[PDB]
Ligand binder design. Structure first.
Ligand SMILES: C[S@@+](CC[C@H](N)C(=O)[O-])C[C@H]1O[C@@H](n2cnc3c(N)ncnc32)[C@H](O)[C@@H]1O
Ligand SMILES: [Mg+2]
Ligand SMILES: [Mg+2]
Ligand SMILES: [Mg+2]
Ligand SMILES: [Mg+2]
Ligand SMILES: [Mg+2]
Ligand SMILES: [Mg+2]
Ligand SMILES: [Mg+2]
Ligand SMILES: [Mg+2]
Ligand SMILES: [Mg+2]
Ligand SMILES: [Mg+2]
Ligand SMILES: [Mg+2]
Ligand SMILES: [Mg+2]
Ligand SMILES: [Mg+2]
Length: 81
RNA sequence: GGCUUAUCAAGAGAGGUGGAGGGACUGGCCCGAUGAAACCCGGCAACCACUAGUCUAGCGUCAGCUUCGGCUGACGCUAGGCUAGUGGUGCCAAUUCCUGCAGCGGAAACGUUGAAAGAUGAGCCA
């Protein structure tokens, strides 16, 4: 649901900075795009699942970025709340 | 900050940190969360100073040679070029990424001349 993202108050964009947000429990939910390189995605589904944080999935990384205000596409987005 | 001048069609880490924009302006078109700027490391390059080493020439002192005018050698100095380090910069996607004023070749794509406007160094002025 790109809506949940386009509606979220605060959020982090991109894999690196998200994994970093997961590493401090500030994250409420995590959205990751299927079409993105798996080596990059599974990186977050693991840290996410292992922590017991909900993980949602969206078809495109180019639409995900659009939902964040970025103009280039994001592999994953953390929702800080 | 400005003026003068030189250069700008090559080269340079799938890097660390970092977090949202960058490519001067211009109209584009590129680059960016698969990570922009900045900082650091690393590299390219050789513009300024210095340090050597190297080559060249004139010159000198000694030394051989002399087909006797003159060559050759070491060494020293002066001068210059090259390379290698220091220190100072600069630079590390797309020709100065393309257009910006005026032309050139070509059938077009494309290539290209000079400016304009920038960028960097050096020397002055602030
Ligand atoms: C295009 S500009 C800038 C070049 C840039 N610094 C480079 O290394 O690619 C060319 C001028 O930069 C100056 N410059 C300063 N540092 C330089 C360097 N390391 N290598 C070449 N040029 C340099 C020179 O005066 C030269 O004429
Ligand atoms: Mg100023
Ligand atoms: Mg000016
Ligand atoms: Mg030219
Ligand atoms: Mg980088
Ligand atoms: Mg911040
Ligand atoms: Mg990074
Ligand atoms: Mg050499
Ligand atoms: Mg680099
Ligand atoms: Mg024209
Ligand atoms: Mg013509
Ligand atoms: Mg056309
Ligand atoms: Mg043209
Ligand atoms: Mg000019």
């Amino acid at each position: 649901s790109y809506d949940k993202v386009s509606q979220a108050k605060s959020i982090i964009i991109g894999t690196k900075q998200t994994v970093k947000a997961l590493k401090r429990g500030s994250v409420k939910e995590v959205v990751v795009a299927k079409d993105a390189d798996p080596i990059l995605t599974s990186s977050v589904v693991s840290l996410a699942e292992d922590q017991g944080i909900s993980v949602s999935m969206v078809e495109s990384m180019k639409k995900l970025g659009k939902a964040c205000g970025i103009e280039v596409g994001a592999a994953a987005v953390a929702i800080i709340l």
